[PDB]
Amino acid sequence: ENEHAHFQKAKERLEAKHRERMSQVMREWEEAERQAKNLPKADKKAVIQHFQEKVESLEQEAANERQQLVETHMARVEAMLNDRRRLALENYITALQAVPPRPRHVFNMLKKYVRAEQKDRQHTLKHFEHVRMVDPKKAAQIRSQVMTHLRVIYERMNQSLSLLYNVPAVAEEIQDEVDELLQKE
Amino acid sequence: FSLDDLQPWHSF
Ligand SMILES: O=C(O)[C@@H]1O[C@@H](O[C@H]2[C@H](O)[C@@H](NS(=O)(=O)O)[C@@H](O)O[C@@H]2COS(=O)(=O)O)[C@H](OS(=O)(=O)O)[C@@H](O)[C@@H]1O
Ligand SMILES: [Mg+2]
Ligand SMILES: [Zn+2]
Ligand SMILES: [Zn+2]
Ligand SMILES: [Zn+2]
Ligand SMILES: [Zn+2]
Ligand SMILES: [Zn+2]
Ligand SMILES: [Zn+2]
Structure with missing residues (x-):
């Protein structure tokens, strides 16, 4: 349901709110420092x-909101991506058992299944790339689980x-269409 | 868990 794009607007909101709260505190600190000139050292x-x-x-507070936003989004996206892939696979296996065989319908059901696998792969790579850019130490820790996910x-x-x-x-009928789909995946 | 969990060649 464009779940990754809803995460980006939320991420942007979180960040603007943090920038706003920080500048407010810096302003208050200036007023206080000024006022403390007339007060004792304590x-x-x-x-x-x-x-x-x-x-x-x-x-x-910002670190905790980031962490909770990433966790909620990863769990939501993984459940959603698993459901789409479970369904697209079940369909593809149903299409393969048609008597007589239906090759064009098998290809249509495979394309939807490959793309569902591809979205899971792409989103896993997108999340790992973010961690690598923002926190190398966390990336080095998760690298093996990520590569395990990619292997699955x-x-x-x-x-x-x-x-x-x-x-x-x-x-034999769809070998040309599948290889023209796999090389672009 | 797995292609296995779907029981493709027998039930579901
Ligand atoms: O050479 C042919 O494939 C030709 O057209 C068939 O139409 C197929 C459609 O292309 C399929 N959908 S698509 O989105 O256009 O790719 C699908 O709806 O069903 C048709 C056959 O594939 S399958 O058997 O369903 O897998 C004609 O199909 S028909 O037999 O239903 O009329 C086929 O006769 C014709 O040679
Ligand atoms: Mg991320
Ligand atoms: Zn995401
Ligand atoms: Zn900050
Ligand atoms: Zn104070
Ligand atoms: Zn982040
Ligand atoms: Zn996955
Ligand atoms: Zn992770």
């Missing part, structure tokens, strides 16, 4: 302390396309 020290804690507290997608898609060559009549 008040000058406390203003510095209250404002350092306020900026640190804001940094932590790739292997399952190959086990699936193999079923097509298992019905030689259908395969």
Whole structure:
């Protein structure tokens, strides 16, 4: 339901709100520092302390909102992508069992299944690329789970396309259309 | 879990 694009608007909102809250605190700190000139040293020290804690507290609030936004989006996108792929695969397997065989209908059901696998692959690569850009240490930690995910997608898609060559009549008829679809994937 | 979970050659 364009779930990744809803995550980008939410990500942008979060960021503008953080920038707004931060500039507000910097403004308040200027007013306070100015006012603390006429006060004793203990008040000058406390203003510095209250404002350092306020900026640190804001940094932590933003970090927590980011983390929770990424987690909620990853879980939502994975459930959605799994459901589309479960359905597109079930259809493709149903199309393969038609008597007499229906090659054009098998290809139509395969295209939708390959693309569903492709979206899962693409979105996994998009999320890992983000982590690599923003947090190399977290990326190095998740790299093996990501590559494992990519291995599952790739292997399952190959086990699936193999079923097509298992019905030689259908395969010989659509071998040109499948390879013209695979090279562009 | 898997192509296996769908039970393609027998039930569902
Ligand atoms: O050479 C042919 O394929 C030709 O056209 C067939 O039409 C097929 C459609 O192309 C399919 N959909 S598509 O989106 O246009 O690709 C599909 O609706 O069904 C048709 C056959 O494929 S399958 O058997 O369903 O797999 C004609 O099909 S017909 O037999 O239904 O009339 C075919 O006769 C004609 O040679
Ligand atoms: Mg991401
Ligand atoms: Zn995403
Ligand atoms: Zn204060
Ligand atoms: Zn910040
Ligand atoms: Zn991020
Ligand atoms: Zn997946
Ligand atoms: Zn992750």
